[model samples]
Target chain A: PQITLWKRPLVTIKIGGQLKEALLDTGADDTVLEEMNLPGRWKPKMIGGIGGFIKVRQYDQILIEICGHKAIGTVLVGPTPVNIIGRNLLTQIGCTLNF
Target chain B: PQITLWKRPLVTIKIGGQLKEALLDTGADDTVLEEMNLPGRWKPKMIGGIGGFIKVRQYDQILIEICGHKAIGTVLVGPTPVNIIGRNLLTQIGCTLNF
Candidate 1:
């Protein structure tokens, strides 16, 4: 799908949480990986960056492709509004922002 | 705090997603658990549920008390609108729903 932001150009993509291709948001600062999207439950210690905070719980990692761009990284998950792709994701992917 | 619902006796409580005491949603069907509330990151397999699934990521868990009641359950977190408790909790606590 194609979406037009207030100042940004149009971006197209498909994604979802419960099902693949559920939610797609372009204004997101980073791409968020939700545990519910994973295949099986996995426990981990010390997740999340920028401050190196850790937590013990189940999580899932999946490859999300958007706007012909792909991001491969570990994402923190829980009950969220919608699995999203934001600035952190764009930074990780080395994508430039022009608005 | 306390609130009144439309026609029905409303209930109000303090809860949060990132910060302690974020939101209080009374008109809900079930409480959605968030993984961010937990502490530390870990990975495991064979630990499954009704609709078994998997993903590699990080998460957290925390204790939440509402209306002087608490339930220890793992929540699926990502980026959500708000941490909420709904009818499921009210049911578990034996709260009645009047129509």
Candidate 2:
């Protein structure tokens, strides 16, 4: 199935058994979510964007469900202004850019 | 045509008679390019992203060519770390998120 790009390309996704709306961000190098508490140890990581870099906690082996497609990958938890689903999870779901 | 999503979804785009690589950013609301001297008067605008908001010069009626498809729309010029092709122009070219 294909998803049409909206003005912001937001989609409902399930992460760690919780549903949330995340921007399908092809521009981001990693998937970043608003700071959340998960029962696991994480590695400290940093990511840079249009403005600057932000420190984040990288949690690996996170189960993600998007449009019924399931994938497991790293998820970055940080003080991000918005939740974003990046290429890490997009690739796992076989998401592509089409015209 | 269908374009596979890359690690960053970077693609070649032609703007203002110059060819450059730009990230196909589904998360960005507006297309932003690195500061460039374009022949036109622009209005000052601001947009927020991952980190914070930045001031930009919005140029309308600009010609853009992406993957052999042509589109004319508003393009923002600012001190962006990278060139991003947002939904504003993507919709004109009928771009979609496919899986």
Candidate 3:
């Protein structure tokens, strides 16, 4: 499937048995979601981005669905201004930059 | 042509007769470059992102080449932590998200 690039490439994703909208951020190193509840134990971590660093809870082996493509990987829940879908899951769906 | 998404989708771009690497940032609204000299009159503007906002010199009608594709649009130059190629330029090259 192909999606045109808008000012912000936002997409609907399902995680933790809930649906959410996240930015398809190629600039971000990891997928960071606004703080959410998960069933498993996670480790506390900090991530730095263009602006500043934020505390995050890293959960491994989490299943996420983006555009009907399922991927199991790490998902970081934190105090992010927005939910960001990063390369970790993007690669799973064979996402690429095409022109 | 298609480019796989790395942790950061970095691409070489030619602007102002100089070559530099920039992140293909779908999350960013405007294309921002690390401080550089560009010919023309520009208006001072500020852009806000995940972290914070930064002052920028918005130069209109500048030519930039990315992945052998030519784009002419507004390019913002300022004290950016990294060079970001946003949708403004990406759409000019018919860039899209593909899997």
Candidate 4:
């Protein structure tokens, strides 16, 4: 969650029975969404950020749709400014940094 | 700047006359690195993050090396956990979120 020097790389996503927007953060290693309820077994986790660290709930093998491309990966729910789709799911969607 | 769920997609980079490592953060619009004393006519700017916001110095037309690829783009100097190679520079290196 930072200032956009220009237009951000924001994309539409469908997750946990809701359609929402998220950021494809290659810098991130896992997907993290804003606080919400998801039905499933999860483990407590902690993540760091620009500010500091925060606790979260990790849900595994969760299905999500990014830009209409569906895939399943681990999802972390926490107090984030926005939802982030990290490399875990991006790799599944065949998303890569092309030259 | 948080915990990596697994092995991170870290890459070696060269900036401000130093060899360093950085993250290719597609989620960000501008590159932000830990405090840098790069010499130039940089302008003061403010950027938002999970910590809310922080002051930074913005330098334009700066050259950087990413994975041995040379590209010129805007660079931000601020207090961050790590160097973030945002889409600004990533695009210059022919980076795209390909699916």
Query: Highest lDDT: which candidate?
Result: 3
Candidate 2 chain A, run of 10 with poorest lDDT: A1-10
Ranking of candidates on TM-score, top first: 2, 3, 4, 1
Clashes of each: 63, 0, 0, 0
Per-residue CA lDDT of model 1 for A1-99, tens digit only, reads 222222222244333433333232222322444444455666664433211233534443455555656655444454333454444444444443111
Model 2 has an lDDT value of: 0.84
How accurate locally is residue B68 in candidate 1, as Cα lDDT from 0 to 100?
A: 54
Is 2 or 4 the stronger prediction by TM-score?
2
For candidate 3, what is the TM-score?
0.92
TM-score of 2: 0.94
> Per-residue alpha-carbon lDDT of model 3 for A1-99, expressed as tens digits?
777886578889999888899988887778999988876999998887655577899999999999878999899998788899999889988899888
TM-score of chain A of each: 0.44, 0.90, 0.94, 0.89
Tell me the TM-score of each prediction against the true structure.
0.30, 0.94, 0.92, 0.81
Worst 10 residues of 4 chain B by lDDT: B1-10
lDDT of 2 by residue, B6-98 (tens): 567788998878899898888888899998877678999988776677899999989989987999989999999999999888888888888
True contacts kept of each: 0.00, 0.78, 0.77, 0.45
Question: Each model's RMSD to truth, in Å?
Answer: 16.5, 1.4, 1.6, 4.9
For model 3, residues B1-99, the per-residue Cα lDDT tens digits are: 787876678889998888999988887778999866889588999887656666788999988999879999999987667899999998998988887
Model 2 CAPRI rating: medium
Local accuracy of candidate 1 as per-residue lDDT tens digits, B1-99: 222221222234333433343223222333443344355553432212112333323332434455555644333343334444444344333343111
Better of 1 and 2 by DockQ: 2
